[PDB]
């Protein structure tokens, strides 16, 4: 289309802003609880879809210059007007609700979409049910769905929210009747439904029937049935009759949250199709199957993994080829446990290469990882806030280390390097010196099993066990591995039992995958399970391992010929 904006549209908007702030050529004024807002009709018509009808339809309000608009806030209307003279919204995190309400009232589509995106990006931990009821009040499919899934995921871990008590029936029915409840047990939703009608027993006995039936026969046991019976308003007979009906019908079926199998997430595997370089797959210890995952960026590699105690997967840093005709990006992502996708989050401030993310006290700690380095100091660390969704700078590393590992034991940060170790106190934000290893080994990782750190491997089969209460390094034994080989060790917790996942490689020989069961007092890796090559193929060298619970139905099996 023939239309420009280079120093002509910006000049026009600046002239309009000058006419507005100087109160020039104004013919309409908005009265908002005594506050006056002189403005123009053209800008209100081009910005809002309600003001065009307010000024076009031949009516008394169209002619009235002193229009008394009510049910609108002064600050929200002021910010909408200034967004209608500058385009700069500049929205905060507190007044988003009233701003979206006034935008829906005035039918201003652009700021509506802006606030919708800002709300869909900021469902962090607490405003979930609140903004869900908000999107139920103002029908918003986008918000509604993201908020629905967000609640299905976190609500089924707290089930004690104050805004949860204040929910409309249809929304509660949609929440409870859905098969997306992230619950490993069926009694938690039962007691949640109970307390939702315990703050309103007697008064709300009408819903005490539908919500009761929604929990289904799995939790409609004779015990709770008779409890509700002896508890109801007096002189209620047909209510007991309709409650007795809910026990045999309505399709008792298993839920989805119970399929929280503790599996083995992997990244940067040997891709099958030669068009792709790496891939992220998974392994099932009990099901003895190999599932796959979608690549978070689909082109960027060299990422770091971390698993919170709430079984959440995150990805930070990494490098992506420039695709000119590997550049480092500080992007961040999060894995969806049901949609099998990756929703990005607030990126980092430094482009890191293979960052080591550690979770502690609800915060994500990214220790080292080439944040970007070119000085004598350089030693730095950036922590993440899972609640406020922001990065906070903390006391930087005491010494600069490369190819290091970091774990968390007893709510404390522990980073391991070639021979040194420092414990970072989250309460005081400082590093304290710890014990030094007698062996200098790098290119290895450590596992935080119980109250002991197990630094395995390094260049080998070095098993150096460290204890926090004792503060000492000791050796246990050597892992049984075939000679003339280079084992790739991986230590991780599984089923509350320390085990390892190692692969041996010889000359003119194929790789073999097998996990062993290690005992504390025996100092021996008993043969737990040998991964058959008929289900799992080669992984590579730069692959990582981490423990986490996943869903088999949401994910897909990795097709590969035995």
């Amino acid at each position: 289309e023939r239309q420009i904006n280079t120093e002509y549209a910006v000049s026009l908007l600046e002239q309009l802003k000058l006419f507005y702030e100087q109160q020039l050529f104004t013919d309409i004024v908005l009265i908002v609880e005594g506050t006056e807002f002189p403005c123009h009709k053209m800008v209100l018509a081009t910005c809002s879809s309600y003001f065009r009808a307010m000024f076009m339809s031949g009516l008394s309000e169209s002619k009235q210059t002193h229009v008394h608009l009510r049910n609108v806030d002064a600050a929200t209307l002021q910010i909408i007007i200034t967004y209608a003279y500058t385009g700069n919204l500049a929205m905060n995190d507190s007044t988003v609700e009233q701003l979206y309400e006034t935008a829906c009232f005035l039918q201003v589509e652009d700021v509506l979409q802006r606030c919708r995106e800002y709300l869909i990006k900021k469902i962090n931990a607490e405003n979930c049910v609140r903004l869900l009821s908000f999107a139920d009040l103002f029908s918003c499919e986008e918000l509604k769905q993201s908020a629905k899934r967000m609640v299905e995921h976190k609500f089924t871990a707290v089930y004690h929210q104050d805004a949860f008590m204040q929910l409309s029936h249809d929304l509660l029915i949609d929440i409870l009747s859905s098969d997306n409840l992230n619950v490993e047990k069926e009694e938690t939703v039962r007691e949640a439904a109970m307390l939702w009608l315990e703050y309103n027993t007697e008064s709300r006995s009408q819903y005490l029937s539908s919500v009761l039936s929604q929990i289904r026969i799995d939790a409609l046991s004779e015990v709770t049935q008779r409890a509700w019976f002896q508890g109801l308003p007096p002189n209620d007979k047909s209510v007991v009759v309709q409650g007795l009906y809910k026990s045999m019908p309505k399709f008792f079926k298993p839920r989805l949250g119970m399929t929280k199998e503790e599996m083995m997430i992997f990244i940067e595997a040997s891709s099958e199709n030669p068009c792709s370089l790496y891939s992220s797959v998974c392994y099932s210890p009990q099901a003895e199957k190999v599932y796959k995952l979608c690549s978070p960026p689909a082109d960027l590699h060299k990422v770091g993994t971390v698993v919170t105690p709430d079984n959440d997967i995150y990805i930070a840093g990494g490098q992506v080829p420039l695709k000119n005709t590997f550049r480092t990006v500080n992007c961040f992502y999060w894995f969806d446990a049901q949609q099998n996708t990756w929703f990005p989050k607030t990126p980092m401030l430094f482009v890191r290469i293979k960052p080591s993310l550690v979770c502690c006290e609800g915060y994500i700690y990214a220790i080292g990882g080439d944040s970007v380095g070119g000085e004598l100091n350089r030693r730095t660390v950036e922590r993440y806030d899972t609640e406020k969704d922001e990065w906070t700078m903390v006391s930087p590393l005491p010494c600069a280390w490369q190819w290091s590992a970091a774990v968390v034991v007893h709510d404390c940060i522990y980073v391991m390097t070639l021979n040194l170790m420092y414990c970072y106190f989250p309460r005081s934000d400082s590093w304290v010196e710890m014990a030094m290893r007698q062996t200098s080994r790098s290119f290895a990782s450590a596992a935080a099993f119980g109250d002991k750190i197990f630094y395995i491997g390094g260049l080998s089969v070095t098993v150096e066990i460290y204890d926090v209460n004792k503060n000492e390094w000791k050796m246990a034994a050597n892992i049984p591995a075939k000679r003339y080989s280079d084992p790739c060790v991986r230590a991780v917790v599984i089923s509350n039992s320390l085990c390892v996942f190692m692969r041996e490689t010889h000359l003119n020989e194929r790789a073999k995958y097998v996990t062993y069961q290690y005992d504390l007092e025996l100092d021996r890796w008993s043969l737990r399970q040998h991964i058959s090559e008929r289900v799992l193929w080669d992984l590579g060298r730069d692959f990582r391992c981490t423990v986490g619970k996943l869903y088999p139905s949401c994910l897909e099996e990795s097709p590969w010929k035995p």
Partner: protein, 279 residues
């Protein structure tokens, strides 16, 4: 809130709409109605508002325009129909404005047609497709187009207005209009052109009949492109050709009295040229 508050809000909104329908929007307040629609759709009561809107619109239609059209079916029938259509449109402008603020959330959530489409559908159902108005409109339009084809001139802009009204009433494309107006007009044109060709084949020869049928095709396509809708021509010209040329082709070129052989023997260049450009 309570049901009494929303009932009073809906009652005052219905009263205001009834005034808008009676062309009394000049004394109405845009703010009061928009804020009431806001507080109505906000409380998740859009279904009741939509049902009440449909009921009020269909009641107003059946009471006013269904009576006005049937009362003036012979004194400026098409003029009164066009006037009622224009009044309905100019009221549904503001009606659709308010209920489009409503329609955003409602039709993006409930997956239904907008209120402008709702008004168009209810108008099509209660006025045009009425049990008596439809056949009367068909008969009068056929009569006036036949009288126009006979040679005498009648009003032509009104037919264009009616065809545009039906095209807009289609509301999706050319589904209803191509059926309510074209389908009947097609049979009438078929019979008319058949009788015209049967009269021309006996009263003239292959010399002056071709110029006459060319002028007929020219005036027909001109009337269809100026007095009717924008495409309007494919089936019309197809049936006109199939009736005239497909019937005159066998007998007008071989029988006798300066057909194709005689007009080629004497050496008539214009005759051969026009026959080639026509056939």
């Amino acid at each position: 809130m309570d049901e009494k508050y929303v009932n009073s809000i809906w009652d005052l909104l219905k009263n205001a709409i009834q005034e808008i329908q009676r062309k009394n929007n000049s004394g109405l307040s845009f703010e009061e109605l928009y804020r009431n629609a806001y507080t109505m759709v906000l409380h998740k009561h859009g279904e009741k508002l939509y049902t009440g809107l449909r009921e009020v619109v269909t009641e107003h239609l059946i009471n006013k325009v269904r009576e006005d059209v049937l009362n003036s079916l012979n004194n400026n029938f098409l003029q009164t129909l066009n006037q009622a259509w224009n009044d309905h449109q100019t009221a549904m402008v503001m009606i659709r404005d308010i209920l489009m603020y409503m329609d955003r959330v409602y039709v993006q959530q409930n997956n239904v047609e907008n209120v402008y489409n709702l008004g168009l559908i209810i108008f099509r159902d209660q006025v045009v497709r009425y049990g008596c108005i439809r056949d009367h409109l068909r008969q009068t339009l056929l009569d006036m187009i036949a009288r126009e084809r006979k040679g005498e001139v009648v009003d032509r802009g009104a037919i264009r207005n009616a065809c545009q009204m039906l095209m807009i009433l289609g509301l999706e494309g050319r589904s209803v209009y191509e059926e309510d107006f074209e389908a009947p007009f097609l049979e009438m044109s078929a019979e008319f052109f058949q009788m015209e060709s049967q009269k021309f084949l006996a009263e003239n020869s292959a010399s002056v009949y071709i110029k006459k049928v060319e002028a007929r095709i020219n005036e027909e396509i001109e009337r269809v492109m100026h007095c009717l809708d924008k495409s309007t021509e494919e089936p019309i010209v197809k049936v006109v050709e199939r009736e005239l040329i497909s019937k005159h082709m066998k007998t007008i070129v071989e029988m006798e009295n300066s057909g194709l052989v005689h007009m080629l023997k004497n050496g008539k260049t214009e005759d051969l040229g026009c026959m080639y450009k026509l056939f």
